[PDB]
Amino acid sequence: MAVPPTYADLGKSARDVFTKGYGFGLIKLDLKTKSENGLEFTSSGSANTETTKVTGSLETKYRWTEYGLTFTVKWNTDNTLGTEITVEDQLARGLKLTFDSSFSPNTGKKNAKIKTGYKREHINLGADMDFDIAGPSIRGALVLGYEGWLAGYQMNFETAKSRVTQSNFAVGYKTDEFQLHTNVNDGTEFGGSIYQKVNKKLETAVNLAWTAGNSNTRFGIAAKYQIDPDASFSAKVNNSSLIGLGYTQTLKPGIKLTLSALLDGKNVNAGGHKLGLGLEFQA
Numbered sequence: 001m002a003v004p005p006t007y008a009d010l011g012k013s014a015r016d017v018f019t020k021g022y023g024f025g026l027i028k029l030d031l032k033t034k035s036e037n038g039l040e041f042t043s044s045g046s047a048n049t050e051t052t053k054v055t056g057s058l059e060t061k062y063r064w065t066e067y068g069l070t071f072t073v074k075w076n077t078d079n080t081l082g083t084e085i086t087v088e089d090q091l092a093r094g095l096k097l098t099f100d101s102s103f104s105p106n107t108g109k110k111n112a113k114i115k116t117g118y119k120r121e122h123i124n125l126g127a128d129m130d131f132d133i134a135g136p137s138i139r140g141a142l143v144l145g146y147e148g149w150l151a152g153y154q155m156n157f158e159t160a161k162s163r164v165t166q167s168n169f170a171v172g173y174k175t176d177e178f179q180l181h182t183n184v185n186d187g188t189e190f191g192g193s194i195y196q197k198v199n200k201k202l203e204t205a206v207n208l209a210w211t212a213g214n215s216n217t218r219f220g221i222a223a224k225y226q227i228d229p230d231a232s233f234s235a236k237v238n239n240s241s242l243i244g245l246g247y248t249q250t251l252k253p254g255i256k257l258t259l260s261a262l263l264d265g266k267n268v269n270a271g272g273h274k275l276g277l278g279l280e281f282q283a
Contacts, residue, residue, distance in 0.1 A: 001063070001070060001086060003098060003119045005034050010143060010152065011170075011181065013193045013207035016236055017218050019244060024262040025274030029056060031281035039063070045076070057081060068092050079106045094118055100130070109133060117141075148174040150181055188212045201227055241265045254283020 008015075026048045032041040045056025059074035063086075070086030082102035089097055100113035109132045117126010124143040129136040142153045150172020158164060170183030170191075179195035191209040198204050202225050209218035220238030227233065231249035236242070243263035250256045260276030 001092075001096070003086075003096070003115075004121060006119075006121055006124075009121070009124075011183075011191075011193045013195075013205055013222055014191060014209060014218065016207065016222060017209075017220065017238075019236065019262070020238075020240070020242065024260075024264070025276055028258070028276070028278035029054075030279060033282040034061065045078075053077070074102070080104065100128075105132075107132070145172065145174070148176075150174055152183065189216075191218070195224075201225070248278075254281075256280040256282060 026046055029043075029045045029047070031043040034040045034042050040061035042059045042061075043056070045054065047054035047056075055078050057074065057076040057078045059072065061070070061072050063070040068088050072084035072086070074081050074083055080103040082100075084101055085099045087097050087099060089095060095118060096116075098115040100115060102113060103111040104113070105111050111130075111132050113128065113130035114136070115126065115128045117128075118124075119126060122144075124141070126142070127138050127140045129138040131137045138156060140153070140155050140157045142151075144151055150170075152170035152172065153168075154170065155164070155167035157167070166186050168183070168185040168189075170181065172181035173179075174181075177197065181194065182192040184190060189209070189211055193205075193207045193209075195205045196203065203223075205222040205224055207218065207220055207222055211217070220236065220240075223235035223237070225233040225235075228249065232247070234246045236244035242265070245261045246258075247260070248256065248258040256279075258278035258280060260278065261273070262276070263273045265271055
């Protein structure tokens, strides 16, 4: 298997904006770990002071060394859990088929996803077919980066030779001391993210993304600070005037603690400062 936990390998800043409407201020319970000798286990959940029970998800990765099949059983209490199972057609090396029986898109049906291709921290290329019940929607994706450079393609490529409008592309440029990587979705969504370093123990980032005329605005600036090698700190600020901050450091033995702080400001809605608490027990 060559499909490690690198889902966040791509631009994270663009996703950072999600924090805006990600229910800022809540409790998070994380434990276990994926990377390990033999089997893997990842436990992640959340909870808050409301009129409902706590939420949690437990994923168990169990594989065998007799043929070449990976059995992933994920159970718990959340919007969806489903399951997953990795299988190889003929040659596992070069072409693998990961069955994603996870109902991510909670709408009210039997959603299903199936990944087909070859991934790798050094180079990822392949397509994925997901859908509800009707025909499976296949999409092409390829994430790879060269010496001081980056390249990412994402399109269904339904056509054979003719050019198709529906196609998302991303160009990354890693300069000596300047990070500039842009991307466009279906030649309609304008996305641009860059990163730069200020001090030896401080860095700043910027994320600018606009649409073709919608309320999906994604323009703003971010901050980064790594006072320590094990610890990590970051922040975010946009026209909304929202002061966001995220800290994460370890204890000593293994238990890691992640603290979050968000400060919004508006009159139309209820103003105030909120702080998030997240725990991680990997060791």
